[PDB]
Amino acid sequence: MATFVELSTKAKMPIVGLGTWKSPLGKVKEAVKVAIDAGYRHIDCAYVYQNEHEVGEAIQEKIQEKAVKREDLFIVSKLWPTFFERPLVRKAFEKTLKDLKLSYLDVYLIHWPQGFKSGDDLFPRDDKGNAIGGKATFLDAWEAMEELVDEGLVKALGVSNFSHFQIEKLLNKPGLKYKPVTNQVECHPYLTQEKLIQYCHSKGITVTAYSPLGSPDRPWAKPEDPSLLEDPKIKEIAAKHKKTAAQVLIRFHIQRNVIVIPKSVTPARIVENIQVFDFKLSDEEMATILSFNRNWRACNLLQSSHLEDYPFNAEY
Numbered sequence: 001m002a003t004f005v006e007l008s009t010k011a012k013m014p015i016v017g018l019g020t021w022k023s024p025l026g027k028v029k030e031a032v033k034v035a036i037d038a039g040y041r042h043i044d045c046a047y048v049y050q051n052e053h054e055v056g057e058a059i060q061e062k063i064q065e066k067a068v069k070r071e072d073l074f075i076v077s078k079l080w081p082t083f084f085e086r087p088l089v090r091k092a093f094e095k096t097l098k099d100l101k102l103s104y105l106d107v108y109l110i111h112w113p114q115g116f117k118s119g120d121d122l123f124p125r126d127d128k129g130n131a132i133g134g135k136a137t138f139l140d141a142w143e144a145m146e147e148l149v150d151e152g153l154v155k156a157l158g159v160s161n162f163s164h165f166q167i168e169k170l171l172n173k174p175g176l177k178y179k180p181v182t183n184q185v186e187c188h189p190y191l192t193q194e195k196l197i198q199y200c201h202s203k204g205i206t207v208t209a210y211s212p213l214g215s216p217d218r219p220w221a222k223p224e225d226p227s228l229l230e231d232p233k234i235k236e237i238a239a240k241h242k243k244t245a246a247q248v249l250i251r252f253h254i255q256r257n258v259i260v261i262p263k264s265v266t267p268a269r270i271v272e273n274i275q276v277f278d279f280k281l282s283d284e285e286m287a288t289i290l291s292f293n294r295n296w297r298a299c300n301l302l303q304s305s306h307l308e309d310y311p312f313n314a315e316y
Ligand SMILES: NC(=O)c1ccc[n+]([C@@H]2O[C@H](COP(=O)([O-])OP(=O)(O)OC[C@H]3O[C@@H](n4cnc5c(N)ncnc54)[C@H](OP(=O)(O)O)[C@@H]3O)[C@@H](O)[C@H]2O)c1
Pocket: 018, 019, 020, 021, 022, 044, 045, 111, 160, 161, 184, 185, 209, 210, 211, 212, 213, 214, 215, 216, 217, 229, 244, 246, 247, 261, 262, 263, 264, 265, 266, 269, 270, 272, 273, 299
C-alpha cells in the first residue's frame, strides 16, 4: 500500500505507519485491525503506552486469518529510560515482545536519551514534578540492545528524541556493533527539523516524524497553542488538491522521504491518513509549508532539562 524508505540494513520501512500513543484499550485492537485492512503494515508501539498487549491481540488475529504475513509487517517498539540498566533492558524487552505476541521486532528504539531512576516506576519525579535521574546511560542501554540484534530478537535498532549531539555520541562510541536505522522525532510544518533531517540522512539514518498533525488531543493543550489542522494556509493547500489538511500534513513528510506515524483510533481517519499516494504537493507548496517553521514543540513533557543528555536545548 505505502511506499518504503530503505534503511542502512536494506530493510524496507513503510513510509506511513500507525501511531498507538494514547490509543485506549477497547479501541486500539480495532484500530490496528482497520489499519491492516486499509493497507498499513508499519505499527508504532511502546512499553510506556501500556497497550502493547491489545496491539498484539490485533496483529495475531490478522495474521491467523491470512489478511497479512509477519514478514510484511513492520513492528516498532521502544525502551523506556527507567530500564537503561543492562538486566532491565532484557526484561522490559521481553515484556514488550510477550505483550505484542511476536517472535521478533523490526526496530527497537531508545525512547528518550536521558536515563531515569531505574525500576518500574515509569515516571519518577520530585514534588515539583521534575524527573529523577538514573546512573545508567543510553549507551549502557544500547549495549544491552545490541545483544537482542545478535540473537535475532530485533532486526534493527534506533533512537528517539535525539539531537545530533546525542547521535554523534552514539556513532562515535568505540566498540559500537550496530548503528541506529532511524531517529524518531516530532516533525511537522511548525517544527520542520531541517538541520536534524539533513544531519541524520548524511549519516545513513532515516527520520520518523511523530505528531505530524500537531497531536491535537494532548491534554496539556492551551487554546493559544497553534493548531495545524485548523491552519488557513495548510487548509488552502488541501483545498487545492481536494484533500484534507491531515492528508497534506502526512504527504509533506513523504515528499521529504521521512517516515510518518499519524495516530488514530477512528476508522475513517485511519483510512483517510493512508490515502496519500494519489496526489503530489508541488515544489512551491512544499516551499510554502517549509516556511511555516516556528520551532514549536507540541510534545515537550519536560522537567528533565536538569539532567545530562537533554536533547531540546541544542540548535539541532
Ligand atoms: N517517540 C516519541 O517520543 C513519541 C512522542 C509522541 C508520539 N509518538 C508516536 O507518534 C504517533 C503520532 O503522534 P501523536 O499521537 O502525538 O499525535 P498526531 O498523530 O499528530 O495526532 C493524533 C490526534 O489526531 C487525531 N487525528 C488523527 N487523524 C486525524 C484526521 N485525519 N483528522 C483529524 N484528526 C485526526 C487523533 O484522533 P483520534 O485518535 O480520536 O482519531 C488524535 O487525537 C504517536 O501515537 C506515537 O506512536 C512518539
